[PDB]
Coordinates of C-alpha atoms in Angstrom, one line a residue:
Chain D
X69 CA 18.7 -26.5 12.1
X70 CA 20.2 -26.7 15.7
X71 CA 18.1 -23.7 16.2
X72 CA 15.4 -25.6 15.1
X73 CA 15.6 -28.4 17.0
X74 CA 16.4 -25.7 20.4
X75 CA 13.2 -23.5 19.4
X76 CA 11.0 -27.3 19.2
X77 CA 12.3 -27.9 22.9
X78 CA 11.6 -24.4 24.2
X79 CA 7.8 -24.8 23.0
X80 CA 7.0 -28.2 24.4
X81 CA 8.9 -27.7 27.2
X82 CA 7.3 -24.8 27.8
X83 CA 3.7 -27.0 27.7
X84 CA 5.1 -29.5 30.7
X85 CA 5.8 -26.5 32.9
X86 CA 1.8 -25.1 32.3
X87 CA 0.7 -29.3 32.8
X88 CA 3.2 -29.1 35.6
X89 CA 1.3 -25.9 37.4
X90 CA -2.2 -27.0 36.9
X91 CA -1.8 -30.0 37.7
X92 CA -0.6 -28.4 41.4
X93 CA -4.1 -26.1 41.3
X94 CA -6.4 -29.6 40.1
X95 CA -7.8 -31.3 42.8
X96 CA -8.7 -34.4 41.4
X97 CA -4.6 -35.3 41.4
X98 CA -3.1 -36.9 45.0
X99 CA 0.0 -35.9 46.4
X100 CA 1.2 -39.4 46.5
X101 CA 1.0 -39.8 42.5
X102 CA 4.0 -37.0 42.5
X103 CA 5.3 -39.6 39.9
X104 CA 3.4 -37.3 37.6
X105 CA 5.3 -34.3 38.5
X106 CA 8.6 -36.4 38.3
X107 CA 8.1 -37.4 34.9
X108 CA 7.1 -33.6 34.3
X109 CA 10.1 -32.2 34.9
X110 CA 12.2 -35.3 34.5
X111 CA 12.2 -34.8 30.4
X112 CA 10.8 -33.9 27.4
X113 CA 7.7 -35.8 26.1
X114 CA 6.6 -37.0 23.0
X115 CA 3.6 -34.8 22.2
X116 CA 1.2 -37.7 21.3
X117 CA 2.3 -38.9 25.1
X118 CA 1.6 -35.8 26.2
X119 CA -1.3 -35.3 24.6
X120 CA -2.9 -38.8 25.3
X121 CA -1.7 -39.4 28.8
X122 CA -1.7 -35.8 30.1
X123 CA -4.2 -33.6 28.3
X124 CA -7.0 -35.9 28.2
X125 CA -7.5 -37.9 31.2
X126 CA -6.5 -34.5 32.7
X127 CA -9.0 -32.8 31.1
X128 CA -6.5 -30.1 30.2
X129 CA -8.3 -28.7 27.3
X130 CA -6.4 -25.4 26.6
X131 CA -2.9 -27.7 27.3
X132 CA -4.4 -30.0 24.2
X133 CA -5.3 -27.0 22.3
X134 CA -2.3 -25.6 22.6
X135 CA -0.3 -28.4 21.6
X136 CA -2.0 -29.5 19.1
X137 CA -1.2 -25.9 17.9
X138 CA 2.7 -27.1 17.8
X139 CA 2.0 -30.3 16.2
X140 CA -0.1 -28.4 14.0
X141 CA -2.8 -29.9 13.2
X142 CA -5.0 -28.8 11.1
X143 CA -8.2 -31.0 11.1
X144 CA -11.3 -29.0 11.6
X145 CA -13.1 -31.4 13.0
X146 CA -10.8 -32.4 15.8
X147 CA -10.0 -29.2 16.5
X148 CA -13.5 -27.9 17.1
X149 CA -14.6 -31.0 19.0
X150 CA -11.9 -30.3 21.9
X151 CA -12.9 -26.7 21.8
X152 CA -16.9 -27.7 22.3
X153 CA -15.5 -29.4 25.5
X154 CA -13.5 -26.3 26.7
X155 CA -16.7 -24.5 26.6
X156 CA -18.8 -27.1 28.3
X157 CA -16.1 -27.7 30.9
X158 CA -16.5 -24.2 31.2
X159 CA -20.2 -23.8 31.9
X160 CA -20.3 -26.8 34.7
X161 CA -18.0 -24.3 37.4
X162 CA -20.3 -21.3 36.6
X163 CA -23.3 -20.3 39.0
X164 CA -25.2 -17.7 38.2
X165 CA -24.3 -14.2 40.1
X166 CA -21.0 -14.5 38.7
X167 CA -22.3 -13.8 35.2
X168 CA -19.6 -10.6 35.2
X169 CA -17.2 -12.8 37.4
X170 CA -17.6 -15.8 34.8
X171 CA -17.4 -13.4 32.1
X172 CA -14.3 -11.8 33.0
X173 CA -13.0 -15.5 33.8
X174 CA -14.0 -16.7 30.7
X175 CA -12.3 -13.9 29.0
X176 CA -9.3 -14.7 30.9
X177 CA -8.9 -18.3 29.8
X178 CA -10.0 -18.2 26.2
X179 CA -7.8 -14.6 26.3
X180 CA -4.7 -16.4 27.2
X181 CA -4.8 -19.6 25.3
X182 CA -6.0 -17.1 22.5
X183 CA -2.8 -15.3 22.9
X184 CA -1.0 -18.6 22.1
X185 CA -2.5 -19.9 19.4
X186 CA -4.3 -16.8 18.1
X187 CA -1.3 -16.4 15.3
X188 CA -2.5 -20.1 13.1
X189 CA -5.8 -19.5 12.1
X190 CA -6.4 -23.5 12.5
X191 CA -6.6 -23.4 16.2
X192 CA -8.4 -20.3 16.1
X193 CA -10.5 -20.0 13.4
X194 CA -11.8 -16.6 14.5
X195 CA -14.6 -16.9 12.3
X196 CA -16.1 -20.2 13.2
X197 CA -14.8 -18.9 16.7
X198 CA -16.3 -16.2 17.6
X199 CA -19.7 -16.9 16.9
X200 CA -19.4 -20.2 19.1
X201 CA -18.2 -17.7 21.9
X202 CA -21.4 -15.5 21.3
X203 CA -23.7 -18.3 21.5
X204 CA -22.2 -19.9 24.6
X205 CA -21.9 -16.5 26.2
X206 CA -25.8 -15.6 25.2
X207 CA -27.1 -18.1 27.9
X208 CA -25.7 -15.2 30.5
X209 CA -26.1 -11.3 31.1
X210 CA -24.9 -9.2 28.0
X211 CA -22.7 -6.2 27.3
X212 CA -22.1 -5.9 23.9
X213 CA -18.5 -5.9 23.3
X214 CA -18.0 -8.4 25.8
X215 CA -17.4 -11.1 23.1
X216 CA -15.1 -9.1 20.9
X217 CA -12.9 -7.0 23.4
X218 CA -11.4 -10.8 24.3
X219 CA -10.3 -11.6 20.5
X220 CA -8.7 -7.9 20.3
X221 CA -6.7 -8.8 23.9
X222 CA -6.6 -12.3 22.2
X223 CA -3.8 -10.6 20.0
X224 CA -6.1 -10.2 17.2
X225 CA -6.1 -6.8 15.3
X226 CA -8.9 -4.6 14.8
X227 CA -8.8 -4.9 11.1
X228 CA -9.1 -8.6 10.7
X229 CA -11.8 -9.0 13.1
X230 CA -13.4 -6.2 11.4
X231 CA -13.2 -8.0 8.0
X232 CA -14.1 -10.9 9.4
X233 CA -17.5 -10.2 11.5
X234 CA -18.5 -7.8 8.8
X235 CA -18.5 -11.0 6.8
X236 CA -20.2 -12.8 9.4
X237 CA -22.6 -10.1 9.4
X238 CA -23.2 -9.4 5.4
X239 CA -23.4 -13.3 5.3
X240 CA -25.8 -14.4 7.2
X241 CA -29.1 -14.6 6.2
X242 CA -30.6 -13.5 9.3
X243 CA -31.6 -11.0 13.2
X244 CA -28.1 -10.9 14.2
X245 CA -28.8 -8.0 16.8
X246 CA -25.8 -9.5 18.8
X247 CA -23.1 -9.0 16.0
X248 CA -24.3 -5.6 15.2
X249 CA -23.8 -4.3 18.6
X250 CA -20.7 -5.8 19.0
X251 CA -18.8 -4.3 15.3
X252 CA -20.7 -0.9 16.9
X253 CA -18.5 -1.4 19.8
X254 CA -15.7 -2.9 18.0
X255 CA -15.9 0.5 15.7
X256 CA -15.8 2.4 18.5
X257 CA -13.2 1.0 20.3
X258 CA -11.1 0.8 17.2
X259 CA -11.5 4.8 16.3
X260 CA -10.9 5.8 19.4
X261 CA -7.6 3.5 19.7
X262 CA -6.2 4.8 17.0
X263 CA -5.4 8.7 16.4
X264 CA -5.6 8.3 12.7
X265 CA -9.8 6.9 12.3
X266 CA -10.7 9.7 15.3
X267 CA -13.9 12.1 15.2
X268 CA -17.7 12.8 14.1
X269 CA -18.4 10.0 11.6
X270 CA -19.0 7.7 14.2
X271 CA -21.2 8.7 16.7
X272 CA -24.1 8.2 14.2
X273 CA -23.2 4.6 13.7
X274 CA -25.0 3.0 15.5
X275 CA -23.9 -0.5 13.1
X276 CA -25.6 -1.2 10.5
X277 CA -24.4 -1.6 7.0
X278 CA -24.2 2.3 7.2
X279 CA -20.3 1.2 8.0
X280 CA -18.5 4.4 8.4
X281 CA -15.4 2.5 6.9
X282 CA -17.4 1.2 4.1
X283 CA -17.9 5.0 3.1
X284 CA -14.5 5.8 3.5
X285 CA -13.3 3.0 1.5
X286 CA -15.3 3.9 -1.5
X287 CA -13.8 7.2 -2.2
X288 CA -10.3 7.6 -1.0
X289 CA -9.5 3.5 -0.9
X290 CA -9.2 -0.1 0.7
X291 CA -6.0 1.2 2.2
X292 CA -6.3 1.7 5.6
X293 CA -3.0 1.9 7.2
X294 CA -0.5 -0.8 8.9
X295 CA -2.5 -3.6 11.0
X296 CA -4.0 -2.2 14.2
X297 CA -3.7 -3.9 17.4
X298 CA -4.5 -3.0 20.8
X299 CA -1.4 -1.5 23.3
Chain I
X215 CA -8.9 4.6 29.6
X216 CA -8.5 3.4 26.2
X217 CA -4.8 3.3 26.7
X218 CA -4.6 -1.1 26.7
X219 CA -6.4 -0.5 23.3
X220 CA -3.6 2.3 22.3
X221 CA -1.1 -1.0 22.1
X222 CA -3.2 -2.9 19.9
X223 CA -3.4 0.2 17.5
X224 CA 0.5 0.4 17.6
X225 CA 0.4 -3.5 16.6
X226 CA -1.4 -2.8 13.6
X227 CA 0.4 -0.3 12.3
X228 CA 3.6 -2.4 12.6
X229 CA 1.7 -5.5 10.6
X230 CA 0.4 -2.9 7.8
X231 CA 3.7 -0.9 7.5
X232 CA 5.4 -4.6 7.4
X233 CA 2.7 -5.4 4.3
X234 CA 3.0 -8.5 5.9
X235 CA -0.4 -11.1 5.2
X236 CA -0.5 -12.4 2.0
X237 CA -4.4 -11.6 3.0
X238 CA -5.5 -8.6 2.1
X239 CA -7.9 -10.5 4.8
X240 CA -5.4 -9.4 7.1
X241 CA -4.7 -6.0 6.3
X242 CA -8.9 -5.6 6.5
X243 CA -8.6 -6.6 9.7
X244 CA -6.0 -4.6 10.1
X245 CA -7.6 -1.4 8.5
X246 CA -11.0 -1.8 10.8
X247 CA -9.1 -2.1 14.2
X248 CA -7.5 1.2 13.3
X249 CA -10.7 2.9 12.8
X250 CA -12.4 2.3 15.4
X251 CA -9.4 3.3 17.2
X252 CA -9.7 6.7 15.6
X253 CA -13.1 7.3 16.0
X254 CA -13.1 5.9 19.4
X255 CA -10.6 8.6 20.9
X256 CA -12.3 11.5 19.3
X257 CA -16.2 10.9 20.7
X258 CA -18.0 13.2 18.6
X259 CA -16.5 16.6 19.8
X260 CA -16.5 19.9 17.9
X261 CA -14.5 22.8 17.5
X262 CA -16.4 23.9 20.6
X263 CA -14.4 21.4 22.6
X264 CA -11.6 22.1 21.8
X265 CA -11.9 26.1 23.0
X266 CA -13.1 25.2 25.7
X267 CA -10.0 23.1 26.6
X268 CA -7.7 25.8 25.6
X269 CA -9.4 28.3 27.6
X270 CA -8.6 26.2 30.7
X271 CA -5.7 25.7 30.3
X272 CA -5.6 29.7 30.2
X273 CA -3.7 29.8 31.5
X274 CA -3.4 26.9 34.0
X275 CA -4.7 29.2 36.2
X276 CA -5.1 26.1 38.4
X277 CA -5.4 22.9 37.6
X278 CA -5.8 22.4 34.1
X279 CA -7.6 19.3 32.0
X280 CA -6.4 19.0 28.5
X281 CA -6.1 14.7 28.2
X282 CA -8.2 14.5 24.9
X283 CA -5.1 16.6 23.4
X284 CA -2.7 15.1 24.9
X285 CA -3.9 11.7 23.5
X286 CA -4.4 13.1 20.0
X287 CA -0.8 14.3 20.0
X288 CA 0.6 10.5 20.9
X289 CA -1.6 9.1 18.4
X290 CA -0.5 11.5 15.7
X291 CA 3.3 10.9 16.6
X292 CA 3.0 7.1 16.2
X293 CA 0.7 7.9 13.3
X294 CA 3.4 9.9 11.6
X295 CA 6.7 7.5 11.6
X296 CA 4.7 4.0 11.1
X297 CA 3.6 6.7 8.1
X298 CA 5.2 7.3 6.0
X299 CA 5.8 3.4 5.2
X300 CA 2.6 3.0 6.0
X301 CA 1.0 5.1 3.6
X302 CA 2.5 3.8 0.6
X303 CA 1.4 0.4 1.4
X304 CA -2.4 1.8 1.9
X305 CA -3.0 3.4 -1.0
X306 CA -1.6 0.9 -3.4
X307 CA -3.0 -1.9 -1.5
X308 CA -6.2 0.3 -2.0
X309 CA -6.7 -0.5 -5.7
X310 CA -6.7 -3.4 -5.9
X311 CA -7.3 -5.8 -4.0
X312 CA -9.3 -5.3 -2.5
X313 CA -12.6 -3.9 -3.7
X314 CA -13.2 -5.2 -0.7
X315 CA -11.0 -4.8 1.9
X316 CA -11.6 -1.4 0.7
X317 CA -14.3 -0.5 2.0
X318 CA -12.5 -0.6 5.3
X319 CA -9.6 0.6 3.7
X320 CA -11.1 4.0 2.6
X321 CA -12.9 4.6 6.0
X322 CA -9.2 4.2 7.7
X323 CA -7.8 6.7 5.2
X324 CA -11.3 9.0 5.8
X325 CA -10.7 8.8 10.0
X326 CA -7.0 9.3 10.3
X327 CA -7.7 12.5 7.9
X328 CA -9.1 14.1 10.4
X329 CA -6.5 13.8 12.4
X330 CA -4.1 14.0 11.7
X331 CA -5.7 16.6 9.2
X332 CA -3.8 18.7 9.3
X333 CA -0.1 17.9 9.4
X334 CA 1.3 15.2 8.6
X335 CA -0.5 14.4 6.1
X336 CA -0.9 16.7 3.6
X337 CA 2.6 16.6 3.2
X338 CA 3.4 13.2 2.6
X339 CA 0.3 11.8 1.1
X340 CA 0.1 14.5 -1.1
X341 CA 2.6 13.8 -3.1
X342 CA 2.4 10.7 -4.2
X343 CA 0.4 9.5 -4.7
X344 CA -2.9 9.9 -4.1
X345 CA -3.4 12.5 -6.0
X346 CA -2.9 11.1 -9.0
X347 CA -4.5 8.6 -8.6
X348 CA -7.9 9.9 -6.8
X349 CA -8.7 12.3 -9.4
X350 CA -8.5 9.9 -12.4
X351 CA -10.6 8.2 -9.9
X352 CA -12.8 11.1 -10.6
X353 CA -13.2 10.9 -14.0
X354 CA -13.8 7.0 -13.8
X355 CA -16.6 8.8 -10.9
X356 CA -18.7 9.3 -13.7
X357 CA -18.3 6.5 -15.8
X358 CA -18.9 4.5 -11.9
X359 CA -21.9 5.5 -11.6
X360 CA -23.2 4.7 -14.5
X361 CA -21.6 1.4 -14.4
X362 CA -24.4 1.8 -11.0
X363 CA -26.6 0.4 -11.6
X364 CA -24.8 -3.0 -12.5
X365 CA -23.0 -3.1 -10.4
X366 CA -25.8 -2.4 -7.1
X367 CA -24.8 -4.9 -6.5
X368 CA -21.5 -4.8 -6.4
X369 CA -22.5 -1.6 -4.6
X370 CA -21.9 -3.0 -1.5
X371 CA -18.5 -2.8 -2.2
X372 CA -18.2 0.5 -3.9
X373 CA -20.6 2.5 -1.6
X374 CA -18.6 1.7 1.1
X375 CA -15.3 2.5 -0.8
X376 CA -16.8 5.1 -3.5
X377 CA -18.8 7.6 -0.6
X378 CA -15.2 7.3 1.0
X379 CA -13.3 8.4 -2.0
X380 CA -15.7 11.3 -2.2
X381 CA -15.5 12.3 1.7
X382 CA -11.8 11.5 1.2
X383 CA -11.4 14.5 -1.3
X384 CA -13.5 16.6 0.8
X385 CA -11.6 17.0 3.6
X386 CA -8.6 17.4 1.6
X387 CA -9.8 20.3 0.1
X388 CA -11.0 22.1 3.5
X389 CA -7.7 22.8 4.3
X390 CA -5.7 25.3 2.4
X391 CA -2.9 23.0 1.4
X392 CA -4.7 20.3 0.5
X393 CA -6.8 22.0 -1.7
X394 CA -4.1 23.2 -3.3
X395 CA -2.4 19.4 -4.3
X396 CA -6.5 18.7 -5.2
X397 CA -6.5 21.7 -8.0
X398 CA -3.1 20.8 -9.0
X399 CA -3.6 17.4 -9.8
X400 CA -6.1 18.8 -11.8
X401 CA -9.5 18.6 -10.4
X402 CA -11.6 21.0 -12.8
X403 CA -10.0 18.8 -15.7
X404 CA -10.9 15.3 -14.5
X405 CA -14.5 16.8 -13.6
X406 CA -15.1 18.1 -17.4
X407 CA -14.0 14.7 -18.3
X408 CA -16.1 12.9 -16.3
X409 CA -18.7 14.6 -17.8
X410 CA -21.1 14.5 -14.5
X411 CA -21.8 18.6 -14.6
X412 CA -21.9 19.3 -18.8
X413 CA -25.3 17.2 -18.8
X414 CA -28.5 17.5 -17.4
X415 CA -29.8 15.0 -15.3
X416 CA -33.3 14.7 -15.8
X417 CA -32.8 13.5 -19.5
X418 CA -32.0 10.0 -18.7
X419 CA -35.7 1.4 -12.2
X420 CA -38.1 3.7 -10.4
X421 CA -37.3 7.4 -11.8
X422 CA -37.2 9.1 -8.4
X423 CA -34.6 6.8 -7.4
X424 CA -32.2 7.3 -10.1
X425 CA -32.8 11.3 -10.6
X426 CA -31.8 10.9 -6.4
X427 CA -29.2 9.3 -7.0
X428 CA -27.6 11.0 -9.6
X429 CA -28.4 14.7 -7.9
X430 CA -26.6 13.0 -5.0
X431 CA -23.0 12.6 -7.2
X432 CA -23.5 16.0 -8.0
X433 CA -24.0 17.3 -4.2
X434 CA -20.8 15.6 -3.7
X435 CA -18.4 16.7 -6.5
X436 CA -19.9 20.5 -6.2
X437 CA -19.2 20.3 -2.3
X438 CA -15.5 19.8 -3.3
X439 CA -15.7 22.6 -6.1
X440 CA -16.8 25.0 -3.4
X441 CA -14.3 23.9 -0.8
X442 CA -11.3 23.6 -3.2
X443 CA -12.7 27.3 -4.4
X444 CA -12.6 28.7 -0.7
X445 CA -10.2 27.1 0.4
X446 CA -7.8 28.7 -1.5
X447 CA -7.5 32.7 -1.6
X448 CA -11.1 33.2 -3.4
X449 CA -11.1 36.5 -5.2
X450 CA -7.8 37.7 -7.3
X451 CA -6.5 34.8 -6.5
X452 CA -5.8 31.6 -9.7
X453 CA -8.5 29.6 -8.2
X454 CA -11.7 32.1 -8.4
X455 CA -10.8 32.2 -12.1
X456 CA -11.3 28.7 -12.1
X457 CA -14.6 28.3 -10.4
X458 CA -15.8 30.7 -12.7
X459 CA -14.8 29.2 -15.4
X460 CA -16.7 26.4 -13.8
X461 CA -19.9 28.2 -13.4
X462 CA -20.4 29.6 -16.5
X463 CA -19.3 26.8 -18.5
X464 CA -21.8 24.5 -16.2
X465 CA -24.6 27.4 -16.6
X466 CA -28.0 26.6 -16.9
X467 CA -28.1 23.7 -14.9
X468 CA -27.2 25.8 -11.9
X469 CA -30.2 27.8 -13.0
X470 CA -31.9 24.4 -14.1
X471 CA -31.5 23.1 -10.4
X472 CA -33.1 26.2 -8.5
X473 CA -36.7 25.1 -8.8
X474 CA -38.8 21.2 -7.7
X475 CA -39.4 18.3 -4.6
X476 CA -39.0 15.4 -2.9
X477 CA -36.1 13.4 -1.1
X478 CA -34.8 14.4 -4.4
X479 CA -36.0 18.0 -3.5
X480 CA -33.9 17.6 -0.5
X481 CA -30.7 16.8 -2.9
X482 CA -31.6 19.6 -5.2
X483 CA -32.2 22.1 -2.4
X484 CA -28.7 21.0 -1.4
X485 CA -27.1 21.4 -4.7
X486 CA -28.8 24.6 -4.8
X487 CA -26.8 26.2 -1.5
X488 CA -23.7 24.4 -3.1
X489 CA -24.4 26.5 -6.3
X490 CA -25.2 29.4 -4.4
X491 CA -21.6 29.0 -2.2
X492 CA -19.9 28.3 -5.3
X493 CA -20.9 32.0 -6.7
X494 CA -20.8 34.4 -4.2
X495 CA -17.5 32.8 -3.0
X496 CA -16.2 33.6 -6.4
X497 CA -16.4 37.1 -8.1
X498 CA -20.0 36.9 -8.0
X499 CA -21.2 34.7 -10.7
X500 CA -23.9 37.8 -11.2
X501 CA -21.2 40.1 -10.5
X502 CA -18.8 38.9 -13.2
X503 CA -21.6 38.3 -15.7
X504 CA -22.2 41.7 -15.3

């Protein structure tokens, strides 16, 4: 239970230290109000404190994600609300020549908060996610792939985002042109990752429900190994 | 380089060994990661390919390429330890739960096989457990289809999984000693039980559909007669016996399928060859009846 109180401290201390750093890279904070910085590093916080007083006048949005990922909370609602402003914070920097810089930017951010929180499914719903990340990204050039690759360096494995966007795929009613090409390039990232998938049924696929796994599933089985993930 | 991607593939075989994810959700996930992996190493090469490589190396008479090997043999070592513990958790997984995870659980089992064709598997996999199981599957093959046309739709599911079971058996048998674990479990057995061959399909939804359909179970289960027969020593050996035995017990619909058209022509024609493969590969059908 002591370690349980120590592992507690490590996590939100850890969260002052990322406050601490941005708030060194925002410009909107003065010097003078170094009291901040003071209180950072002075002591722990409560999290609703840190949440409240930090995180939203601050417009830290991953820093509230995050936390709200150790409080662990769960409402839906909430949740997606702050991650709708992420997006839109998001959107104001961009200019448009940037659409690869952006994208590789915007991989980078939702890639490392991803990384954090990508373990509770709350905070990262990856279904309800990643079809928010396909619509924002859509207002910009494409590369198919572009989406997915973040949620695999997100931390999340190549079979439960297959699972998943096959779902998202089966179950909507509609065009989706966008989440085919992306499972085609998930699939073919994934076989070649792995030794074990490699060769010739593949190169066909071109994604459709003609799922290559989906074949392979029927006759030998569902079982297709230990959970995936990329090196 | 996939090589950041080669991490997330060793992830995933930790979780799945681990069993961990009361979601079978998960291990889906898991199970699709992996094959793309697979598939993505290996771009559609053949046999060709891989001459070629060796050639150059031939010896490294300068500077030699030979990466896409090199790759393969990492990915086949990982494959192998995660494996074994793996492999248990795969297959049982495979029943159940998921009829659906399953279709992405079958097309993981389907890519690994080729690579990691030959070795590692056969022995391993072979034992246990899959054998058994897959060619009661067989029998239940027939009874599946049938069940067909209920379940089309449940037929997402299965035609994922079920075409996967097929291939999986395949390639099992293209290889001499995974023929051999196919025909001991008992192949020709679970194939008279299931009843699919000692019929005639036209007997008896639109009629061209379903005679396509059912003609296309047969092009299946005959490909792995053949191979199984091949694959093996086919001539003295136990196993021409046994295709024989096949044939002539089966008569009559070989000679029932040489003649017809359509799409279903284009199934026939292709049972046809399978027929054909199937008899000269033995004693000749003609020769033994002679």
């Amino acid at each position: 239970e002591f370690l349980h109180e120590l592992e507690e401290k490590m996590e939100v201390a850890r969260i002052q230290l990322q406050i601490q750093e941005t708030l060194q890279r925002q410009y909107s904070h003065h010097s003078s109000v170094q009291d901040a910085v003071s209180q950072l590093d002075s002591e722990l916080m409560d999290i609703t404190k840190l949440y409240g007083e930090f995180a939203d006048p601050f417009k830290l949005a991953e820093c509230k994600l995050a936390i709200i990922h150790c409080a662990g909370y769960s409402d839906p609602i909430l949740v997606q609300t702050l991650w709708q402003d992420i997006i839109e914070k998001e959107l104001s920097d961009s200019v448009t020549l940037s659409s690869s810089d952006r994208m590789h930017a915007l991989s980078l951010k939702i890639v490392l908060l991803g990384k954090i929180y990508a373990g509770t499914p709350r905070f990262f719903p990856l279904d309800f996610i990643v079809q928010f990340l396909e619509q924002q990204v859509c207002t910009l050039n494409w590369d198919v792939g572009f989406v997915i690759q973040t949620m695999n360096e997100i931390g999340v494995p190549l079979p439960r985002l297959l699972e998943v966007y096959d779902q998202l795929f089966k179950s909507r009613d509609p065009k989706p042109l966008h989440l085919l090409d992306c499972i085609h390039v998930l699939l073919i990232r994934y076989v070649e990752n792995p030794s074990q998938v490699l060769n010739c049924e593949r190169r066909r696929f071109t994604n459709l429900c003609l799922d290559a796994v989906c074949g392979y599933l029927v006759e030998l089985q569902s079982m297709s190994s230990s959970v995936a993930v990329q090196a | 380089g996939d090589s950041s991607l080669y991490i997330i593939l060793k992830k995933l075989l930790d979780f799945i060994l681990k069993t961990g994810g009361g979601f079978q959700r998960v291990r889906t996930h898991l199970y699709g990661s992996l094959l793309y992996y697979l598939q993505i190493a290996q771009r559609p090469d053949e046999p060709d390919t891989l001459e070629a490589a060796k050639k150059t190396m031939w010896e490294r008479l300068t500077a030699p390429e030979d990466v896409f090997s090199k790759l393969q043999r990492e990915n086949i070592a990982i494959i192998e330890s995660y494996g074994a513990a793996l492999m248990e958790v795969v297959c049982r997984d495979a029943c159940d739960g998921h009829e659906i995870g399953r279709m992405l659980a079958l097309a993981l089992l389907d890519r690994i096989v080729s690579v990691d064709k030959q070795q590692q598997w056969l022995l391993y996999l072979s034992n246990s457990g899959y054998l058994k199981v897959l060619v009661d599957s067989l029998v239940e093959d027939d009874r599946t289809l049938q069940s067909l046309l209920t379940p089309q739709p449940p037929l997402l599911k299965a035609l994922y999984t079920y075409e996967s079971k097929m291939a999986f058996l395949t390639r099992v048998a293209k290889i001499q000693q995974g023929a051999l674990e196919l025909l001991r479990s008992g192949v020709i057995v679970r194939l008279a039980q299931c009843q699919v061959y000692d019929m005639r399909p036209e007997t008896d939804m639109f009629i061209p559909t379903p005679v396509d359909r059912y003609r296309q179970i047969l092009l299946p289960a005959l490909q792995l007669c053949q191979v199984i027969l091949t694959s093996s020593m086919a001539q003295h050996l136990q196993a021409a016996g046994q295709v024989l035995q096949f044939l002539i017990s089966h008569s009559d619909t070989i000679q029932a399928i040489l003649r017809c058209q359509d799409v279903s022509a284009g199934s026939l024609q292709e049972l046809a060859l399978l027929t054909g493969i199937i008899s000269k590969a033995a004693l000749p059908g003609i020769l033994s009846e002679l």
